[PDB]
Write an enzyme that holds these catalytic residues in place. Structure first.
Site, PDB file in Angstrom:
ATOM      1  CG  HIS A 138      -1.776   1.201   1.378  1.00  0.00           C
ATOM      2  ND1 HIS A 138      -3.109   1.190   1.020  1.00  0.00           N
ATOM      3  CD2 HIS A 138      -1.526   2.443   1.856  1.00  0.00           C
ATOM      4  CE1 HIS A 138      -3.641   2.371   1.278  1.00  0.00           C
ATOM      5  NE2 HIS A 138      -2.703   3.151   1.785  1.00  0.00           N
ATOM      6  CD  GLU A 139       1.822   2.861   3.662  1.00  0.00           C
ATOM      7  OE1 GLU A 139       1.707   3.987   3.126  1.00  0.00           O
ATOM      8  OE2 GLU A 139       0.930   2.367   4.384  1.00  0.00           O
ATOM      9  CG  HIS A 142       0.153   6.140  -0.666  1.00  0.00           C
ATOM     10  ND1 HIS A 142      -0.957   6.756  -1.201  1.00  0.00           N
ATOM     11  CD2 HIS A 142      -0.259   5.554   0.483  1.00  0.00           C
ATOM     12  CE1 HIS A 142      -1.996   6.551  -0.410  1.00  0.00           C
ATOM     13  NE2 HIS A 142      -1.598   5.826   0.619  1.00  0.00           N
ATOM     14  CG  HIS A 148      -6.312   5.882   0.377  1.00  0.00           C
ATOM     15  ND1 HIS A 148      -6.559   6.451   1.609  1.00  0.00           N
ATOM     16  CD2 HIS A 148      -5.056   5.375   0.445  1.00  0.00           C
ATOM     17  CE1 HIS A 148      -5.502   6.297   2.385  1.00  0.00           C
ATOM     18  NE2 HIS A 148      -4.575   5.648   1.702  1.00  0.00           N
TER      19      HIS A 148
HETATM   20  C1  LIG Z   1      -5.753  -0.973  11.105  1.00  0.00           C
HETATM   21  N1  LIG Z   1      -5.392   0.406  10.789  1.00  0.00           N
HETATM   22  C2  LIG Z   1      -5.951   0.975   9.702  1.00  0.00           C
HETATM   23  O1  LIG Z   1      -6.695   0.408   8.901  1.00  0.00           O
HETATM   24  C3  LIG Z   1      -5.566   2.432   9.504  1.00  0.00           C
HETATM   25  N2  LIG Z   1      -5.160   2.702   8.133  1.00  0.00           N
HETATM   26  C4  LIG Z   1      -3.848   2.872   7.908  1.00  0.00           C
HETATM   27  O2  LIG Z   1      -2.967   2.796   8.764  1.00  0.00           O
HETATM   28  C5  LIG Z   1      -3.510   3.194   6.460  1.00  0.00           C
HETATM   29  C6  LIG Z   1      -2.627   2.087   5.869  1.00  0.00           C
HETATM   30  C7  LIG Z   1      -3.338   0.736   5.694  1.00  0.00           C
HETATM   31  C8  LIG Z   1      -2.389  -0.277   5.055  1.00  0.00           C
HETATM   32  C9  LIG Z   1      -4.586   0.870   4.845  1.00  0.00           C
HETATM   33  C10 LIG Z   1      -2.797   4.545   6.407  1.00  0.00           C
HETATM   34  O3  LIG Z   1      -3.588   5.568   6.993  1.00  0.00           O
HETATM   35  C11 LIG Z   1      -2.378   4.916   5.013  1.00  0.00           C
HETATM   36  O4  LIG Z   1      -3.215   5.174   4.151  1.00  0.00           O
HETATM   37  N3  LIG Z   1      -1.059   4.932   4.766  1.00  0.00           N
HETATM   38  O5  LIG Z   1      -0.830   5.097   3.419  1.00  0.00           O
HETATM   39  C12 LIG Z   1      -6.722   3.363   9.894  1.00  0.00           C
HETATM   40  C13 LIG Z   1      -7.886   3.188   8.900  1.00  0.00           C
HETATM   41  C14 LIG Z   1      -7.201   3.031  11.317  1.00  0.00           C
HETATM   42  C15 LIG Z   1      -6.220   4.817   9.845  1.00  0.00           C
HETATM   43 ZN   LIG Z   2      -2.598   5.248   2.315  1.00  0.00          ZN
END
Ligand SMILES: CNC(=O)[C@@H](NC(=O)[C@H](CC(C)C)[C@H](O)C(=O)NO)C(C)(C)C
Ligand SMILES: [Zn+2]
Ligand SMILES: *[C@@H]1O[C@H](CO)[C@@H](O[C@@H]2O[C@H](CO)[C@@H](O[C@@H]3O[C@H](CO[C@H]4O[C@H](CO)[C@@H](O)[C@H](O)[C@@H]4O)[C@@H](O)[C@H](O[C@H]4O[C@H](CO)[C@@H](O)[C@H](O)[C@@H]4O)[C@@H]3O)[C@H](O)[C@H]2NC(C)=O)[C@H](O)[C@H]1NC(C)=O
Ligand SMILES: [Ca+2]
Ligand SMILES: [Cl-]
Ligand SMILES: [Cl-]
Length: 203
Positions: A138-139, A142, A148
């Site tokens: 995912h990173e 980006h 997203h």
């Molecule tokens: C279990 N935690 C989560 O799902 C968190 N999401 C993230 O940590 C994302 C990464 C995940 C890999 C989707 C992050 O915000 C991101 O977009 N980095 O690019 C929440 C939604 C709680 C913010």
């Molecule tokens: Zn993200």
């Protein structure tokens, strides 16, 4: 014209400690996470080449704190010196530290190949290696200019399938594919000149 990502992966000191200070098993965790990252990126027709691997067995080389962003940029600064000795396209930190705000990963947008920002950080949050891998992919997404997924994206890879990698939230079952929207964004990114360093086939 094939795309290859030369990946350098780092395990921080905390991860090493959660792995009972076992170097071999910490390296194995990195290898398995890198394998899943390769599987996920291949759905974007990008093959991963694990260029290097590092475990911070005695002390963190960059400051790792509860602040995901602070940790990300401290890592990126350290990565500059690493790059001079061990060239790679993207460096990814896998940490045993939990970040504030439930954040599990971060990365600069469109920074692939950029000296100051071609990297990311991910917490090893699941017992399953695919958890960390989906976050790392995912990173990397980006870094490749992927946003997203809009709600009207990821036509299929049903709920039980784990969905798509660029979802804003993660959790089991984890995603194993990138959406069609992500594919289209990637092709536009490459056409416009981004990610030029993914053009060479690793030696
Ligand atoms: C279990 N935690 C989560 O799902 C968190 N999401 C993230 O940590 C994302 C990464 C995940 C890999 C989707 C992050 O915000 C991101 O977009 N980095 O690019 C929440 C939604 C709680 C913010
Ligand atoms: Zn993200
Ligand atoms: C995630 O974390 C990173 C790192 O903490 C944040 O990035 C920093 O963002 C701030 C503001 O955007 C930047 O601040 C600017 O610093 C310039 C000098 O930088 C030197 O010093 C800093 C701190 O010691 C070092 O990090 C850096 O390596 C340099 O050695 C100043 O010149 C800037 O001031 C001038 O510009 C501003 C804005 O343009 C004007 O308002 C002022 O009048 C002035 O002319 C400014 O203070 C900082 O450089 C960034 N650090 C980096 C790039 O590593 C992210 O913002 C953060 N992400 C979040 C929280 O979303
Ligand atoms: Ca390359
Ligand atoms: Cl095109
Ligand atoms: Cl064009």
């Amino acid at each position: 014209t094939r795309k290859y990502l030369e990946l350098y992966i780092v395990a921080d000191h905390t991860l090493f400690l959660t792995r009972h200070r076992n170097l071999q098993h910490t390296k194995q965790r990195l290898l398995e996470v890198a394998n899943y990252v390769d599987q996920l990126l291949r759905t974007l027709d990008i093959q991963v080449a694990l260029t290097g691997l590092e475990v911070w067995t005695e002390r963190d080389r960059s400051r790792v704190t509860q602040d995901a962003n602070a940790t990300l940029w401290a890592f990126l600064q350290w990565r500059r010196g690493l790059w001079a000795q061990r060239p790679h396209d993207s460096a990814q930190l896998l940490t045993g530290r939990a970040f504030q705000g439930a954040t599990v990963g971060l990365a600069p947008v469109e920074g692939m190949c950029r000296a100051e920002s071609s990297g990311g950080v991910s917490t090893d949050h699941s017992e399953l290696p695919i958890g960390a891998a989906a976050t790392m992919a995912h990173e990397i997404g980006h870094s490749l200019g992927l946003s997203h997924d809009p709600d009207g994206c990821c036509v299929e890879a049903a709920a039980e399938s784990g969905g798509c990698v660029m979802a804003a939230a993660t959790g089991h079952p984890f995603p194993r594919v990138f959406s069609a929207c992500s594919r289209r964004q990637l092709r536009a990114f490459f056409r416009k000149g981004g990610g030029a360093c993914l053009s060479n086939a690793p030696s």
